[PDB]
Structure formats: structure tokens, C-alpha cells
Design a protein around this nucleic acid. Structure first.
Ligand code: NI
Length: 145
DNA sequence: TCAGCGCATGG
DNA sequence: CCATGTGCTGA
């Protein structure tokens, strides 16, 4: 059994990014105090220019901040994203929270979507709760565990 | 614990 | 106008 997250009516962006933990965590950072309506389109623009942590760590933060300007929090995120992508590739880690820029919300997303620990996960984030609650209620109907 | 970050949108 | 949008770091 390998864990594959089901699609929910909430349409969390994590539901299509589960197979790429780096991209999922990048998405979390984009959603930090930022609406998904604004962040997600910019996310796709970012991902095409920086498809991996290899390219993102070798990136220049001025180009990234420029891309994050209409979202807000453009300067610090740009440096955070680069540093995170560097640590994700270098620093030995068991969970993404050990990395910089990722906190509880980013780490809970990982444990729910990227691995099967969603039973052991108790998220504080609102949208995560909705998906997490929707999970228990329908997991037997979707034949999950 | 908490200032700071930051622009857009609906109150 | 204030409040918040799928938060986190540093201190
Ligand atoms: Ni962290």
C-alpha cells in the first residue's frame, strides 16, 4: 500500500502536488498569509522557471521577488524559497519542518499528502482541517487506511 | 511571546 | 477605513 491523497471538493492545491514534496512545500510558502486565487497562478509561473530545488537554489532572489511582488511578502519569501530549496537538497532531514521557511502548516501538509500519517496529523490551518475532516468521513467509502 | 512582513480583496 | 488570506522567522 502506497498513500495517494484523494481529490476533495475543496480543491486544495496540495491534492495535485502530493507526488512532489518540494513543490507542495513551495506551494505552502506561497499560501502564507496569501490568497490561493492570487498565489497559485504565480506558483505555476514560478514552477516553470524553477522546476526543481536544484534550479531554485542556484536562483537569484531578485528575479524571484520580482515575481512575488503583486502577492506581497516578495523579498523575504524569495530568500526563504532559495534557502529552503538549498536545505531540501543538502541538509539531512526526516521532516520538512526541520528546514527553513517550513513550520507546522507546511509540515502538516507533508504528513497528510506526501506520506500516510494523516491519522496522526492534527492541523491548525483552516483549509487543512476541512480536507482532514473530509478525510475521516469518506476514507472508508474511498477504501483507504 | 511578538514585531515584522506586504499586496489584494471583501467586510 | 480594518481584517484576513491554506505562516514563519528571529529574537
Ligand atoms: Ni522549519
Amino acid at each position: 500500500m502506497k498513500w495517494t491523497p484523494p481529490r476533495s471538493p475543496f480543491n486544495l492545491v496540495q491534492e495535485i502536488l502530493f507526488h512532489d514534496p518540494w513543490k507542495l512545500l513551495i506551494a505552502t510558502i506561497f499560501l502564507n498569509r496569501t490568497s490561493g486565487k492570487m498565489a497559485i497562478p504565480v506558483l505555476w509561473e514560478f514552477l516553470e522557471k524553477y522546476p526543481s530545488a536544484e534550479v531554485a537554489r542556484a536562483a537569484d532572489w531578485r528575479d524571484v521577488s520580482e515575481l512575488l511582488k503583486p502577492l506581497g511578502l516578495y523579498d523575504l519569501r524569495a530568500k526563504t524559497i532559495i534557502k529552503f530549496s538549498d536545505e531540501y537538497l543538502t541538509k539531512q532531514w526526516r521532516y520538512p519542518i526541520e528546514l527553513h521557511g517550513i513550520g507546522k502548516y507546511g509540515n502538516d501538509s507533508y504528513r497528510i499528502f506526501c506520506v500516510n500519517e494523516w491519522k496522526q496529523v492534527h492541523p491548525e490551518n483552516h483549509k487543512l482541517n476541512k480536507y482532514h475532516d473530509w478525510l475521516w468521513e469518506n476514507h472508508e467509502k474511498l477504501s483507504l487506511s
